[PDB]
Design a protein around this nucleic acid. Structure first.
Ligand SMILES: C[S@@+](CC[C@H](N)C(=O)[O-])C[C@H]1O[C@@H](n2cnc3c(N)ncnc32)[C@H](O)[C@@H]1O
Length: 290
RNA sequence: GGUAAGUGUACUGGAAAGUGCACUUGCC
């Protein structure tokens, strides 16, 4: 659909990924090759590129004809391509060390990228997937609005769910947006650029699907008091007493609003919710739609 | 109150944009 061909920009992106000399990179959805021409020009060790659409191959291969052995083009679907088997076991560096010599770079349709960052976020929770090499970093691409929420801060206008879901597992710099006018063809949206480094110590240590559930119910009624959406974690019968103990033990003023909660206010609540989940087995599958 | 355009707007973990709401106007 909408492609990025401006060398000034494709360069700026690969610059904002970090030093890439003799590194290994996985570019998702290379497309016409703008991003990957620039990647190739950062003297990398090898660039693996996975692309769903066969017709971008002739052109992508002209780029590899220009840098032989540097570019490995793989005909694959990003949402199912198992990158963990894609590079040498040699590059696995431990989680407390520095990020491995492995980087992800992507400019995919927002249709694909948004779900991807979700399945990749829990991949970081579990330290599997692309993160078997351990705290591998990512440079990807979202509609300016979505880029904003990912990096939004406690109290910001656009502090939403992916604020919490991304920041508790990662350091999340949203380092610049670019105008839709820069794209062939220009969409009626601006485009934003976010970098992720997986956090050594995550800001919350509970199963991903737990704080996925917890953060959801908070941001449910986004400008009301937090307790009014929270309380829906609990079936009608227990709901009053339960919500009390939860806010009590977690130490949260219920007048607080979802956008005002510290990334640690969340750690607080989930620890308490995990406790009362393990004290009541039939509680974590409760959802009000019933 | 029903529809179309406009303008605001809210929400979005379906955002290369979508939908909901409000108001005004034209027509019914
Ligand atoms: C909006 S175009 C952008 C073109 C190019 N990536 C760029 O930055 O200029 C997105 C590209 O991602 C690819 N793509 C979309 N879904 C994909 C998927 N599931 N797996 C691999 N590639 C995908 C498409 O083939 C297309 O080439």
């Amino acid at each position: 659909q909408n492609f990025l061909l401006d060398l000034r920009l494709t360069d700026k992106i690969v610059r904002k990924a970090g030093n890439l000399t003799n590194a290994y990179v996985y570019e998702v959805g290379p497309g016409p090759g703008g991003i990957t021409r620039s990647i190739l020009n950062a003297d990398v060790a090898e660039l693996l590129v996975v692309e769903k659409d066969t017709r971008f191959i002739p052109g992508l291969q002209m780029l590899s004809d220009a840098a032989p052995g540097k570019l490995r083009i793989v005909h694959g679907d990003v949402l199912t391509f198992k990158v963990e088997k894609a590079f040498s076991e040699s590059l696995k560096r431990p989680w407390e060390d520095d990020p491995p010599n492995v980087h992800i770079i992507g400019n995919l349709p927002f249709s694909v990228s948004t779900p991807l960052i979700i399945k990749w976020l829990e991949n970081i929770s579990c330290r599997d997937g692309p993160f078997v090499y351990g705290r591998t970093q990512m440079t990807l691409t979202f509609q300016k609005e979505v880029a904003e929420r990912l990096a939004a801060n406690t109290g910001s206008k656009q502090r939403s769910r992916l604020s919490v879901m991304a920041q508790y597992l990662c350091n999340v710099r949203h380092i610049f947006t670019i105008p839709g006018q820069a794209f062939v063809p220009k969409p009626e949206v601006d485009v934003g650029v976010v970098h992720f480094t997986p956090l050594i110590q995550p800001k919350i240590e509970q199963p991903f699907k737990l704080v996925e559930k917890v953060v959801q119910n908070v941001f449910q009624f986004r400008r009301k008091y937090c307790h009014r959406g929270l309380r829906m974690l609990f079936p009608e019968a227990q709901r009053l007493e339960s919500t009390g103990r939860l806010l009590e033990l977690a130490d949260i003023d219920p007048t607080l609003r979802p956008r005002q909660l510290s990334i640690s206010h969340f750690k607080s609540l989930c620890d308490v919710y995990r406790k009362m989940c393990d004290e009541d087995p039939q509680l974590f599958a409760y959802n009000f739609r019933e």
